[PDB]
Design an enzyme around this catalytic site. Sequence first.
Site, PDB file in Angstrom:
ATOM      1  N   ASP A 235      74.361 117.187 -53.844  1.00 50.76           N
ATOM      2  CA  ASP A 235      74.494 117.145 -52.400  1.00 50.76           C
ATOM      3  C   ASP A 235      74.304 118.514 -51.804  1.00 50.76           C
ATOM      4  O   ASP A 235      74.991 118.884 -50.862  1.00 50.76           O
ATOM      5  CB  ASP A 235      75.840 116.550 -52.046  1.00 50.76           C
TER       6      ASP A 235
ATOM      7  N   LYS B  17      67.975 119.632 -50.367  1.00 48.99           N
ATOM      8  CA  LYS B  17      67.332 118.564 -51.139  1.00 48.99           C
ATOM      9  C   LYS B  17      66.169 119.009 -51.975  1.00 48.99           C
ATOM     10  O   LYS B  17      65.871 118.405 -53.012  1.00 48.99           O
ATOM     11  CB  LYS B  17      66.897 117.391 -50.248  1.00 48.99           C
TER      12      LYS B  17
ATOM     13  N   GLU C   6      76.456 109.668 -43.004  1.00 51.69           N
ATOM     14  CA  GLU C   6      77.818 109.951 -42.532  1.00 51.69           C
ATOM     15  C   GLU C   6      77.930 109.962 -41.017  1.00 51.69           C
ATOM     16  O   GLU C   6      77.120 110.593 -40.325  1.00 51.69           O
ATOM     17  CB  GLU C   6      78.285 111.293 -43.131  1.00 51.69           C
TER      18      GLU C   6
ATOM     19  N   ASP D 296      73.198 112.277 -53.199  1.00 51.69           N
ATOM     20  CA  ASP D 296      73.299 111.922 -51.797  1.00 51.69           C
ATOM     21  C   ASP D 296      71.969 112.040 -51.088  1.00 51.69           C
ATOM     22  O   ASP D 296      71.109 112.804 -51.505  1.00 51.69           O
ATOM     23  CB  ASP D 296      74.331 112.812 -51.128  1.00 51.69           C
ATOM     24  N   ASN D 297      71.812 111.325 -49.974  1.00 49.77           N
ATOM     25  CA  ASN D 297      70.728 111.587 -49.006  1.00 49.77           C
ATOM     26  C   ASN D 297      69.353 111.338 -49.543  1.00 49.77           C
ATOM     27  O   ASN D 297      68.400 112.016 -49.148  1.00 49.77           O
ATOM     28  CB  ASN D 297      70.772 113.020 -48.494  1.00 49.77           C
TER      29      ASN D 297
HETATM   30  C1  LIG Z   1      75.592 118.617 -47.671  1.00 52.90           C
HETATM   31  S1  LIG Z   1      76.720 120.033 -47.702  1.00 52.90           S
HETATM   32  C2  LIG Z   1      77.783 119.547 -49.045  1.00 52.90           C
HETATM   33  C3  LIG Z   1      78.743 118.447 -48.582  1.00 52.90           C
HETATM   34  C4  LIG Z   1      79.772 118.092 -49.650  1.00 52.90           C
HETATM   35  N1  LIG Z   1      79.175 117.591 -50.936  1.00 52.90           N
HETATM   36  C5  LIG Z   1      80.698 117.014 -49.096  1.00 52.90           C
HETATM   37  O1  LIG Z   1      80.299 115.839 -49.167  1.00 52.90           O
HETATM   38  O2  LIG Z   1      81.759 117.325 -48.561  1.00 52.90           O
HETATM   39  C6  LIG Z   1      75.513 121.102 -48.648  1.00 52.90           C
HETATM   40  C7  LIG Z   1      75.901 122.486 -49.199  1.00 52.90           C
HETATM   41  O3  LIG Z   1      75.138 122.951 -50.310  1.00 52.90           O
HETATM   42  C8  LIG Z   1      75.171 124.390 -50.226  1.00 52.90           C
HETATM   43  N2  LIG Z   1      74.012 124.828 -50.965  1.00 52.90           N
HETATM   44  C9  LIG Z   1      72.680 124.836 -50.556  1.00 52.90           C
HETATM   45  N3  LIG Z   1      71.896 125.213 -51.599  1.00 52.90           N
HETATM   46  C10 LIG Z   1      72.730 125.447 -52.674  1.00 52.90           C
HETATM   47  C11 LIG Z   1      72.482 125.816 -54.006  1.00 52.90           C
HETATM   48  N4  LIG Z   1      71.244 126.085 -54.467  1.00 52.90           N
HETATM   49  N5  LIG Z   1      73.532 125.915 -54.850  1.00 52.90           N
HETATM   50  C12 LIG Z   1      74.840 125.683 -54.371  1.00 52.90           C
HETATM   51  N6  LIG Z   1      75.102 125.303 -53.089  1.00 52.90           N
HETATM   52  C13 LIG Z   1      74.048 125.182 -52.268  1.00 52.90           C
HETATM   53  C14 LIG Z   1      75.188 124.706 -48.738  1.00 52.90           C
HETATM   54  O4  LIG Z   1      75.625 126.052 -48.501  1.00 52.90           O
HETATM   55  C15 LIG Z   1      76.076 123.599 -48.172  1.00 52.90           C
HETATM   56  O5  LIG Z   1      77.436 123.995 -48.204  1.00 52.90           O
HETATM   57  O1  LIG Z   2      70.747 116.501 -41.959  1.00 56.34           O
HETATM   58  N1  LIG Z   2      71.526 115.698 -42.396  1.00 56.34           N
HETATM   59  O2  LIG Z   2      71.769 114.623 -41.854  1.00 56.34           O
HETATM   60  C1  LIG Z   2      72.124 115.974 -43.662  1.00 56.34           C
HETATM   61  C2  LIG Z   2      73.026 115.076 -44.187  1.00 56.34           C
HETATM   62  C3  LIG Z   2      73.593 115.305 -45.442  1.00 56.34           C
HETATM   63  O3  LIG Z   2      74.475 114.512 -46.042  1.00 56.34           O
HETATM   64  C4  LIG Z   2      73.261 116.496 -46.188  1.00 56.34           C
HETATM   65  O4  LIG Z   2      73.766 116.613 -47.399  1.00 56.34           O
HETATM   66  C5  LIG Z   2      72.285 117.399 -45.606  1.00 56.34           C
HETATM   67  N2  LIG Z   2      71.866 118.530 -46.266  1.00 56.34           N
HETATM   68  O5  LIG Z   2      72.397 118.917 -47.262  1.00 56.34           O
HETATM   69  O6  LIG Z   2      70.907 119.191 -45.803  1.00 56.34           O
HETATM   70  C6  LIG Z   2      71.780 117.117 -44.350  1.00 56.34           C
HETATM   71 MG   LIG Z   3      74.757 114.898 -48.071  1.00 56.21          MG
END
Ligand SMILES: C[S@@+](CC[C@H](N)C(=O)[O-])C[C@H]1O[C@@H](n2cnc3c(N)ncnc32)[C@H](O)[C@@H]1O
Ligand SMILES: O=[N+]([O-])c1cc(O)c(O)c([N+](=O)[O-])c1
Ligand SMILES: [Mg+2]
Length: 214
Positions: free
Chosen positions: A140, A143, A198, A168-169
Amino acid sequence: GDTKEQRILNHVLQHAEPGNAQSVLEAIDTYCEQKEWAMNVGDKKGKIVDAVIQEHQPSVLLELGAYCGYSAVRMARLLSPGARLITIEINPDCAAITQRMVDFAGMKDKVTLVVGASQDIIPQLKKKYDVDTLDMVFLDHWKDRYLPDTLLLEECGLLRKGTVLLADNVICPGAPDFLAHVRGSSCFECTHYQSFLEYREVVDGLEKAIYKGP
Ligand SMILES: C[S@@+](CC[C@H](N)C(=O)[O-])C[C@H]1O[C@@H](n2cnc3c(N)ncnc32)[C@H](O)[C@@H]1O
Ligand SMILES: O=[N+]([O-])c1cc(O)c(O)c([N+](=O)[O-])c1
Ligand SMILES: [Mg+2]
């Protein structure tokens, strides 16, 4: 000033019940539905994450992408004594938020937070984090890393037959190259779980890809 991630944390600290993981999740979900959208896996897809954990009972679970700690709390609350979640987060401020959220939810004894990029940490998991193989991985993060990190996990010897990848996603924003790889490859048995993005009615889904051996 403050940021969205800080406002989500503050809402939890001020309105959720200390030590109550379910109350932490509900506070985050309420804040994000009523005030500000954020990219937590959320409740609908989170129910599917919960079901995968319950069906696999992983002892070593790796999360790529922590953000504010929603999914780390959600997953950790279903692990058994002695199981562990290792969560990798590239942004140090998000990592700090995630540790604060985990601790508040009463999950600190289950979680190892690592600050860094997944691609930098994965090759160190055996030597620095005492991992042999992983039971499950929740992808997650951004992507464009899903495919290359899946290939890294395999090539580093971290997958075993039956290891579950849950991404996810896969619909929105989408992870089509990851999907084409795991579906097409005889090394992964895949199932698609359609659901909703979400806090929205936008369709999304998760892919469960079970490694079958090289
Ligand atoms: C979609 S949010 C994660 C949401 C979390 N899994 C939740 O459901 O609560 C994505 C995150 O991945 C982190 N991120 C992006 N690229 C990454 C990488 N190469 N390694 C570790 N974290 C990364 C971002 O800083 C961000 O916090
Ligand atoms: O843009 N979005 O709707 C999302 C949703 C998501 O659940 C993500 O994890 C995300 N992301 O990691 O970039 C972006
Ligand atoms: Mg996600």
